């Protein structure tokens, strides 16, 4: 059913590989990894962060508002 041999039909695709004992496990890990991470972060920061920033603003206001509510009201004890 789902086995290597009849999954799909592919033609004229040549793949070149290398032995894991002939290549480095961390090739250019920081020279190319760090720029790549920045690219990925930049592409997603404007789609992931903004919703969470709203939560932080709501969380701060709610915490402050709850504190203010418990605070003493001088006008209530006037007269």
């Amino acid at each position: 059913g789902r086995e290597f041999g009849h999954l799909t039909r592919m033609r004229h695709v040549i793949t070149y590989s290398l032995s894991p004992f002939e290549q480095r496990a961390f090739p250019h890990y920081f020279t190319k990894g760090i720029p790549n991470v920045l690219r990925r972060t930049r592409a997603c920061i404007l789609r992931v962060a903004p919703p969470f920033v709203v939560f932080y603003l709501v969380y701060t206001w709610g915490t402050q508002e709850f504190e203010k509510s418990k605070r003493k009201n001088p006008a209530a004890y006037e007269n």
């Binding site: 086995e3 290597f4 041999g5 009849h6 999954l7 799909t8 592919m10 590989s17 032995s19 894991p20 004992f21 002939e22």
Partner: protein
């Protein structure tokens, strides 16, 4: 059997002179073969086969051809 015929003998002579620098007589080949036993076969195969990175060439409907990591793992035995 390969040395039956004038053309095979000439090819053997030329190739031997190009590669070995000399024509190896069949007597020397037989002596070298007779030197071979089970221990020699095991040792040489271990030297050249056991736990070695191979080169693979596939062509055609080779979707089932095992991944190179799997083939490399197949190039050694856990039991041994």
């Amino acid at each position: 059997s390969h040395l039956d015929g004038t053309t095979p003998v000439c090819e053997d002579i030329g190739r031997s002179l190009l590669t070995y620098g000399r024509r190896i007589p069949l007597a020397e080949w037989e002596s070298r073969i007779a030197e071979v036993d089970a221990s020699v076969v095991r040792e040489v195969c271990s030297k050249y086969f056991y736990d070695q990175c191979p080169a693979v060439a596939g062509l055609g409907p080779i979707e089932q051809l095992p991944d190179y990591n799997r083939i490399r793992s197949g190039m050694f035995w856990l039991r041994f």
